[PDB]
Amino acid sequence: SLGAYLSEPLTTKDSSDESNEFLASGSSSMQGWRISQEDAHNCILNFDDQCSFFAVYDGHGGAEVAQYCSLHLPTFLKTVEAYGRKEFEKALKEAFLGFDATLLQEKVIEELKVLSGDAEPGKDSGCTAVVALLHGKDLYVANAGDSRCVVCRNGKALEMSFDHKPEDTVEYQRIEKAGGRVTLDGRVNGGLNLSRAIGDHGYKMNKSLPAEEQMISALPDIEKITVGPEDEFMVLACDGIWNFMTSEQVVQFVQERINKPGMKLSKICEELFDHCLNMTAIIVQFK
């Protein structure tokens, strides 16, 4: 009796829990022992005055751009013009596009090289990014890629993203106009299976077109809600989760566990991974 256990690689779960007076969070990330990390994340409860910041980045191969996002993206966001003006949808768009542009700078590439371990990081590597910014009770979610953010609203899953993949109609139209194609197995020009990312500048080299019209685009879709009594929690996770479970199923899985005595949010993430089995998830429970 060995079944699937045999083929399953050595992994470990790196978990954490924090709280403030306004929310509680837990996260876990699972990594295999001999295959490289691909994911990174942020969980910053004290991001700014009345503000918290959460994010999942997924390198789809190399980890350096994912890592670099977790190290520099939150701080870059605070510098954009619209951020001090409290126009958060505009700020998030400015931050993704502005930060993407920094990846072509020589000094930035030096750091990407260290993070990586004739590679051209930022050109031949990149990551999907989903970011949740909470400013008081106002929740803004920016998504560029196939990680997902789901809120439990009125006892039901509410997608705050806006998942993107090459076969999607809007994605395909952009890829088409930019001279690209999508193989039957969902790969842009037969290479990457992503349509939105930070980095991967090798797919952003049409000098005719603005940044947001490149085959692979760093432009996030943004959605806002105002969280109140009926918004119990949110989940950010990578495609490792959504490949196996729908938004509804995940919300129900979290609901089946969240107010159980002694249950840590990070532990729910771990159990989610088990049920599903580089896996990364964050649960934020709103007070």
Contact positions vs Zn ion (CB under 5 A): 16, 39, 43, 58, 71, 146, 173, 176, 238-240, 278, 280
Nearer to Zn ion, 50 or 173 (CB): 173
Report how far apart, in Å, the C-alpha atoms of 25 and of each of 130, 234, 267 are: 16, 10, 11
185 is in an annotated binding site: no
Contacts 24+ apart (CB under 8 A), 102-105: 102/76, 103/65, 103/68, 103/198, 103/199, 103/201, 104/201
Was 275 annotated as part of a binding site? no
Q: Is 138 annotated as a binding residue?
A: no
Q: Which residues contact 138 (CB under 8 A, 6 or more apart)?
A: 88, 224, 225, 226, 227
Query: Judged by CB, which is closer to Zn ion: 90, or 189?
Result: 189
User: Which residue number places its CB atom closest to Zn ion?
Assistant: 238
DSSP secondary-structure letter at 156?
E
Question: Residue 133 or 153: which CB sits closer to Zn ion?
Answer: 133
Q: Is 39 annotated as a binding residue?
A: yes
Least distance from Zn ion to the Cβ atom of residue 75, Å = 9
Nearer to Zn ion, 187 or 224 (CB): 187
- Cα–Cα dist 29/40, whole Å: 8
Choice between 176 and 212, CB closer to Zn ion: 176
Phi-psi region of 154 (alpha: psi -120 to 50; beta: other; left: phi over 0): left
Return the number of the residue (130 or 139) whose C-beta is nearest Zn ion: 130
Asked if residue 111 belongs to a known ligand binding site, the reply is yes
Is 37 within any annotated ligand binding site?
A: no
User: Do 233 and 227 contact (CB within 8 A), yes or no?
Assistant: no
Handedness of CA 217, 181, 177, 207 (dihedral sign): positive
Which DSSP helix (H) or strand (E) runs through 173? Answer: helix 169-177
Q: How far is the CB of 38 from Zn ion (least distance, A)?
A: 6
d(CA 58, CA 33): 18
Judge whether 41 is annotated as a binding position. yes
Whether the CB-CB separation of 141 and 226 falls below 8 Å is answered with no
38 labeled binding residue: yes
- Smallest distance from the beta carbon of 279 to Zn ion, in angstroms? 5
In the complex, minimum distance from the CB of residue 64 to Zn ion, in angstroms, rounded to a whole number: 11
Provide, rounded to whole angstroms, the least separation between the CB of residue 254 and Zn ion.
18
Q: How far is the CB of 251 from Zn ion (least distance, A)?
A: 19
In sequence order, the β-bridge partners of residue 127 are 198
Numbered residues of the known binding site for Zn(2+): 38-39, 41, 58, 60, 72, 111, 146, 173, 176, 238-239, 278
Numbered residues of the known binding site: 38-39, 41, 58, 60, 72, 111, 146, 173, 176, 238-239, 278
